[PDB]
From a paper:
To confirm this, we used site-directed mutagenesis to generate [name] mutants [name] and C209S. Catalytic turnover of these mutants was greatly reduced with D- and L-histidine compared to the WT enzyme, as expected. Mutation of an active site cysteine to serine is a common strategy to aid crystallization of cofactor-independent epimerases and racemases, and likely aids the process because this mutation slows catalysis and helps to keep the enzyme in the open conformation. In the asymmetric unit of [name], there are two back-to-back dimers, while the asymmetric unit of C209S has one dimer and two monomers. Structures of [name] and C209S [name] were very similar, with a backbone r.m.s.d. of 0.493 Å by aligning α-carbons of 260 residues, and each adopt a DapF-like fold. In each structure, a sulfate (mutant [name]) or a phosphate (mutant C209S) is found in the active site directly between catalytic residues. The substrate binding pocket of [name] has an overall negatively charged surface, and does not contain any basic residues. The position of the loops above the active site spanning from residues 42 to 49 (N-terminal domain) and 197 to 206 (C-terminal domain) in [name] more closely match the conformation of the open C. glutamicum structure than the substrate-bound, closed form. Overlay of the structures of CntK and [name] showed that while these two enzymes have relatively low sequence identity (28%), their structures are overall very similar, especially within the active site. The positions of backbone atoms in DAP and 4-hydroxyproline substrates were highly conserved, and interactions with their respective epimerase enzymes were very similar.
In this work, we set out to find the physiological substrate of the cofactor-independent racemase (predicted DapF, [name]) from F. nucleatum ATCC 25586, and were surprised to find that this enzyme functions as a [name] ([name]). Here, we characterize this enzyme as a [name] ([name]), and found that catalytic turnover is ∼10,000× faster with L-histidine than with L,L-lanthionine. The rate of [name] was not affected by buffer composition (PO4 or Tris), ions (SO42−, Mg2+, and EDTA), or the PLP inhibitor hydroxylamine; however, the enzyme activity was hindered by iodoacetamide and Hg2+, which are known inhibitors of enzymes with catalytic thiols. These results, along with a sequence alignment of [name] with other cofactor-independent racemase and epimerase enzymes, suggested that [name] operates via a two-base mechanism using cysteine residues 67 and 209. The DapF-like fold is an overall α+β structure, in which the monomer unit is composed of two structurally equivalent N-terminal and C-terminal domains.
Residue numbers in the entry:
A (entry chain A): 3 to 265
B (entry chain C): 2 to 265
């Protein structure tokens, strides 16, 4: 059979492992099929994958990803003869209609960077009481984040909550949701993400949109304007300024070259 | 204090035992262990083991033999041989193996897919142990001692129960490592459980060529089974006993290659 050779760049945006495929039809029909192949452990590993063209980033499912957009912005600095310490890069991403002005700065090594990006605004902020648990609820365009504060609630297993949430959205149509298990003693967060297609949960290494939900929620409930939220395999800082949300974090270009898959 | 190191990498999938081979590097660098450690992280290029190439030699990150890695190296040689058609034998060497390794590489469906057969080290001991209520066929080797367990031929048990029982065996025996081949005769399946004193914990590998070898030896005595294809958690390897010599066959796919950037 035919082996298809693609141009790849592997990047670690604060643990949210991203692969970017270059010189590829960003609107190819088979993108979702080869994307899951690119991500398996039996191939190059990845938590997400995108297909770049000029200054656009076409995610595998037309979704917007703050972490992926920051990886793409750090890649343009990596490849820019003129980049010194700081430089703003304008890009576009599927799922966001506005041009994104990403502030990229050097973070030590030439492959290491720090990328800040403007994050979408929330559509609603509710504080909900489900059964005998308090939860935070932040509704975005596409995904609904839930904030479960470990300390502020009684002892329980995560699994009980993932099920309880799933019960809350029983009579509510959604494409995906997220539970941000938040530990106040540490200012840490374990991001959870269910989606309809996968039909199963996924504990991520870091979740940019989830950190904004966390951020919006700590702003309204505790008057916290910006903070650094440590996550399973990385960290992200949320910044609220002039009523605008921004997520900053580290980024690192891992590897670059060719990837051989079937056709 | 900021410096990027640029290495040539090849990512291969020898029956689920993800391998990264580094090319054109000093295979006797002091920093090899630390470089292998960072390259293996999930937050980096992912890998279960790292090798370092020099001509026809493969230098594993610690100086130890790996049948899967060697199979991956040979498959790479075939990948880069413009004259490889459908089958070709390749002569290579591997750290921790005093004898040259003639590897039989064959096409497996495409230019990146290969079937590679390799000769494996012979066992140093073969014996049937009987702990508490269960029996288990120890097949020792220079490095690791594998503990076969036939589940169809044993009473109802828990995997963890056995693991503990075996770990208590090894108390009075100095062991740098040990493994447990959970073998199911009905489906010819095998769950390779491994343990290391340094790690202090176990892992169920996607494949173990040396464990399939141990299984094969015990099956040749306990059944007179000379060869069989053993399905594993994320891959399959076939064992072939021939002229009292152990071979391991299996698939190897070339995943990717290019450059990797590591700070120093």
């Amino acid at each position: 059979r035919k082996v298809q050779v693609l141009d790849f760049i592997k990047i670690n945006p604060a643990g949210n492992i991203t692969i970017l495929i270059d010189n590829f039809d960003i609107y190819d029909k088979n993108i979702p099929k080869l994307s899951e192949e690119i991500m398996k452990e039996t191939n190059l590993y990845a938590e997400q994958v995108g297909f770049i063209k000029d200054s656009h980033l076409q995610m595998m499912g037309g979704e917007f990803s703050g972490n992926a957009s920051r990886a793409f912005a750090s890649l343009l600095a990596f490849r820019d003869k003129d980049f010194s310490k700081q430089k703003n890069y304008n890009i576009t991403c599927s799922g966001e209609s506005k041009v994104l002005d990403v502030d990229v700065r050097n973070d030590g090594a030439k492959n290491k960077f720090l990328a800040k990006i403007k994050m979408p605004k929330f559509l609603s902020l509710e504080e909900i009481n489900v059964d005998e648990y308090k939860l935070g609820l932040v509704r975005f365009s596409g995904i609904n984040h839930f904030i479960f504060n470990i300390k502020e609630n009684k002892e329980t297993s995560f699994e009980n909550i993932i099920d309880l949430v799933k019960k809350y959205l029983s009579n509510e149509e959604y494409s995906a949701f997220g539970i941000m298990f938040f530990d106040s003693d540490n200012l840490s967060m374990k991001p959870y993400v269910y989606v309809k297609e996968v039909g199963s949960g996924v504990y991520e290494n870091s979740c940019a949109s989830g950190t904004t939900a966390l951020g919006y929620y700590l702003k309204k409930c505790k008057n916290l304007d910006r903070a650094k939220i440590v996550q399973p395999n990385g960290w992200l800082e949320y910044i609220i300024e002039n009523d605008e949300m921004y997520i900053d974090g580290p980024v690192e270009i891992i590897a670059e070259g060719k990837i051989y898959i079937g056709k």
